[model samples]
Target: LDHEYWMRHALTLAKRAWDEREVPVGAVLVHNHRVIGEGWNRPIGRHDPTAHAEIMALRQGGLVLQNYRLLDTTLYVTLEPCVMCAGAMVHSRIGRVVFGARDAKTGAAGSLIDVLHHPGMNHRVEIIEGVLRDECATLLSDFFRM
Candidate 1:
């Protein structure tokens, strides 16, 4: 199937879940062992993925076996998803992605995308933009990377 087809499907589900229940959404795109794109709630609590992604990658280099499950097929996030995690996914063999917005506070700016797009991983990444709206912003205050 076309990468856009899969992304729209995951993006739609994430937006619907978050809009209706305010629950966190995560996604992983996988094709032949390559993770295309991934993302999740950057909100508060232990589920916080920003730092978790860092630990999983810089610390472990995406070694978590089940980590793929977090995004084995295709990953859609309610937020920009963490850069480190996104890059790790690219490193792990992800092909496409879709998500809400990018992290405004991350000093890395779009560096994560740079990493994912490094070596021509660009088309493999996509952002859903505006999917979070106001609710996601509200959750951001609590999950601030402070």
Candidate 2:
């Protein structure tokens, strides 16, 4: 679970998503702190993966990876991954989930985890707290309220 590897790969995917979908925000995801990939808005201008409003790339990226394999995979998203995006992971049958943190608020809190634990995932989940969550607090202040 290399966070850097996850981040790098997530970043790359986000960029593609933005490019193909015109996503205004940028995103980069990681696994266990190492970047697996990255992503961001792709336009005619300079769209740095590090620059954007919201980064929701990790979850989808992880789901994408799951489509290609069945091994357990961990995804580190700057924010909570949506329930809809968890489709592939559950379908692909992977085990375990590690996050930098969870939402403190009511809405987004445990949303993805709830989806993962719907009694049919056939997998387990592990969330890493404190360290990375604290470190990235500034970058994810918006999600802090949620």
Candidate 3:
């Protein structure tokens, strides 16, 4: 339906990340009302720096669609993407991004520095922020507090 419904699914993936002792970030890539890909942060477990939730989701989405450019796809994530993930989205040509919480320290959509919507980029990604913000924020806070 809307961002919240999709974001709730992302939260499920985030919980999977939590279970793996990761950062508790998660993402789902959707197209035409169906989820094409879903992923959770797993850099520590996977031993790859690119194992971010967004990157993992995008990788699966590419595999699902059999295309490198994930055109017309919406990515829902628990946290705002960092530079590397944002750069991947730019390259993949993602249609939009819906995030539950902002990343003040490393947010690439807009908080730290605008990368997704930068003027230099040929592709543009629509950003919808703060979807179920408190619920998303609390999950991370709750995880780290322990």
Find the candidate with the highest TM-score and give its number: 3
**For model 3, how does the per-residue alpha-carbon lDDT over 54-106 read when each residue is reduced to its tens digit?**
99899999999999999999999999999999999999999999999999998
CA shift of 4, model 2, Å: 8.2
Task: Write model 2 residue lDDT over 17-131, tens digit each, in one string.
Answer: 4455543223444344444434454443445543321223443455656544444445444334444434544553434444444555421327424666666656545544333
lDDT of 3 at 19: 94
Stretches > 4 Å off in candidate 3: none
Q: After superposition, how far is residue 60 of candidate 2 from its true place, in Å?
A: 9.4
Candidate 1 wrongly placed segments (more than 4 Å): 1-72, 107-113, 119-123, 142-146
User: Which of candidates 2 and 3 reaches a greater lDDT?
Assistant: 3
Q: Rate the local accuracy (lDDT) of all candidates.
A: 0.44, 0.44, 0.94
Which residue pairs come into collision in candidate 3?
none
Top candidate (lDDT):
3
Per-residue C-alpha lDDT of model 1 across residues 19-132, encoded as one tens digit per residue: 533344444444454543333333344454453422222223234344543333344444565556666556555433444455665512263334554566633544345454
Per-candidate TM-score against the hidden true structure: 0.44, 0.47, 0.97
- Which window of ten consecutive residues has the lowest lDDT sum in model 3? 1-10
RMSD per model, one decimal: 7.7, 7.6, 0.8
